[PDB]
Amino acid sequence: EQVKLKKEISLLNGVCLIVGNMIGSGIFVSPKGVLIYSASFGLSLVIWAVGGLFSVFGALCYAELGTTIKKSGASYAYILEAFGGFLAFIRLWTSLLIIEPTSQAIIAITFANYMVQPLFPSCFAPYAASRLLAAACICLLTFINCAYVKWGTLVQDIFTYAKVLALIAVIVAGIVRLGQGASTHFENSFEGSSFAVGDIALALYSALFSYSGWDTLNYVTEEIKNPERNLPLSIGISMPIVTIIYILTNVAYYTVLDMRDILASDAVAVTFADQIFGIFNWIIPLSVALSCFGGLNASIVAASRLFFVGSREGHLPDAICMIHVERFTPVPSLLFNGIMALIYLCVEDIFQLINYYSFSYWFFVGLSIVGQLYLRWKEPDRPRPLKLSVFFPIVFCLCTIFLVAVPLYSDTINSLIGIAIALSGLPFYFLIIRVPEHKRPLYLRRIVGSATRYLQVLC
């Protein structure tokens, strides 16, 4: 009965946090980032499959890591127990300022856009709506996750079911248009491609960037029923599902659209629909909005638990490690994440904020893998229920080196401002965190007063 974040995330709610968070407005809108560089369908599908394989290697690394550690945080519990503190600190701080607020605000804006879109198919949706609809979405998901976490897993479940239904719809349309005929785009000179170290590297980067989120279940891993089984099994059931969904929906696309109008189109699914569904060409913008809703709910669960864990370790203020008394949901962490996402709804060029945290994000996943190897070396006696091999940590450490080098020479000043964000986090750690609580002024008294006032949100 004691205040503890009860588990209540089954295997199904495990597969829905990963699949949900993963397939979101990635293959729905301009997924041709792997087609611009691999200028052919055959090479495009080969690079989809290869990026999927390498994301599977990363997800198996994280299954082993999350069954080894059994602490939520998913990049912050694996840097904190392998390395120490400071690096974990600037992983919560990068996720606190730039990574999680921006990603949630962008998913909210992209949900608003494609909710409104069937009304404004050619005209661009206004900036007044498509930001107020985004704030309504963020606030609704924060409230749904703040009331009952079973509600939050339910929302995630429903909208992941919607995602998979819509993508099965487009995949079925593609297979139909392939069986009846219409196989000109496919299997005929399929690979008049652009084999080149630059182009192949950038297409692999775009694919491996498109399967992100495989580490979403690891954020909520103190709340899984028997994590030892349900975390690796849910990851290993989610990753082939999402890889298959990706390569099949791209097959469909290529079968219907063409190399020309599949580029130079804003949201290629909303092009595919216009070519096939006809009068029901609004279903696909509706499904992009639903998939963005599922992805936003998963981002909110994961970010709320990242900040909760971060404050439980002493990094974020105590007020953020607090459960609700009767509902058992991290109310102050969720309010904080919602505050941050809504603040980042006021920014105009947020899709420009993407790239800083892009480099930093893959850096931190890499540092977590490096920490897994550090633990394999230093403590080869910790109970690891699922210990696969070293081959997967090694290959995905290499793939992380690649995914970190690509945005460091392509656009370097942005990644430098990302490192600047982490450096800006540094002073709080070297001046507030590392203080042993008995050197701070009556700022402590203010902090405790505020923490009590916010304790008056659980009662």
Q: Which residue ranges make up the site for ligand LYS (CB under 6 A)?
A: 21-22, 24-26, 103, 210, 212-213
When the beta carbons of 212 and 360 are compared against ligand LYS, the nearer one is 212
When the beta carbons of 55 and 255 are compared against ligand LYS, the nearer one is 55
When the beta carbons of 103 and 287 are compared against ligand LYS, the nearer one is 103
- Least distance CB 25 / ligand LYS (angstroms): 6
Burial class (CB in 10 A: 0-12, 13-18, 19+), 327: middle
- Residue corresponding to tokens 């990026």: 51
CA dihedral 1, 322, 94, 157 (to 10 degrees): 50
72-104 b/e (C-beta count within 10 Å ≥ 16 → b): bbbbbbbbbbbbeebbbbbbbbbbbbbbbbbbb
- Least distance CB 205 / ligand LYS (angstroms): 13
When the beta carbons of 22 and 252 are compared against ligand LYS, the nearer one is 22
SS3 category, 438: coil
Say if residues 51 and 33 touch (Cβ distance below 8 Å). Answer: no
- Least distance CB 55 / ligand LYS (angstroms): 10
When the beta carbons of 276 and 406 are compared against ligand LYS, the nearer one is 406
- Least distance CB 206 / ligand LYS (angstroms): 11
When the beta carbons of 210 and 311 are compared against ligand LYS, the nearer one is 210
- Least distance CB 270 / ligand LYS (angstroms): 16
- Least distance CB 389 / ligand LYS (angstroms): 26
Q: DSSP letter at 125?
A: P
When the beta carbons of 24 and 66 are compared against ligand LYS, the nearer one is 24
Q: DSSP letter at 34?
A: G
Closest by CA position to 104, among listed 278, 295, 250, 266: 295
When the beta carbons of 210 and 368 are compared against ligand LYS, the nearer one is 210
Give me 243's structure tokens. 């890889």
Say if residues 54 and 206 touch (Cβ distance below 8 Å). Answer: no
- Least distance CB 306 / ligand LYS (angstroms): 11
What is the Cα–Cα distance from 184 to 372, expressed in whole angstroms? 47
φ/ψ bin of 258: left (φ > 0), alpha (ψ from -120 to 50), beta (otherwise): beta
Residue, CB closest to ligand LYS: 26
Burial class (CB in 10 A: 0-12, 13-18, 19+), 119: exposed
User: In the chain, what's the furthest Cα-to-Cα distance?
Assistant: 76
When the beta carbons of 302 and 319 are compared against ligand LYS, the nearer one is 302
- Least distance CB 28 / ligand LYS (angstroms): 9
Please count the other Cβ atoms lying within 10 Å of the Cβ belonging to residue 383. Answer: 9
When the beta carbons of 321 and 334 are compared against ligand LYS, the nearer one is 334
What is the Cα–Cα distance from 70 to 330, expressed in whole angstroms? 19
What is the Cα–Cα distance from 429 to 76, expressed in whole angstroms? 15
What is the Cα–Cα distance from 259 to 40, expressed in whole angstroms? 7
- Least distance CB 326 / ligand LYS (angstroms): 31
Dihedral pair phi/psi, residue 151, rounded to 5° = -60, -40
When the beta carbons of 193 and 304 are compared against ligand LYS, the nearer one is 304
- Least distance CB 166 / ligand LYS (angstroms): 15
- Residue corresponding to tokens 């230093």: 378
293-324 b/e (C-beta count within 10 Å ≥ 16 → b): bbbbbbbbbbbbbbbbbbbbbebbbbbbbbbb
- Least distance CB 452 / ligand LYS (angstroms): 34
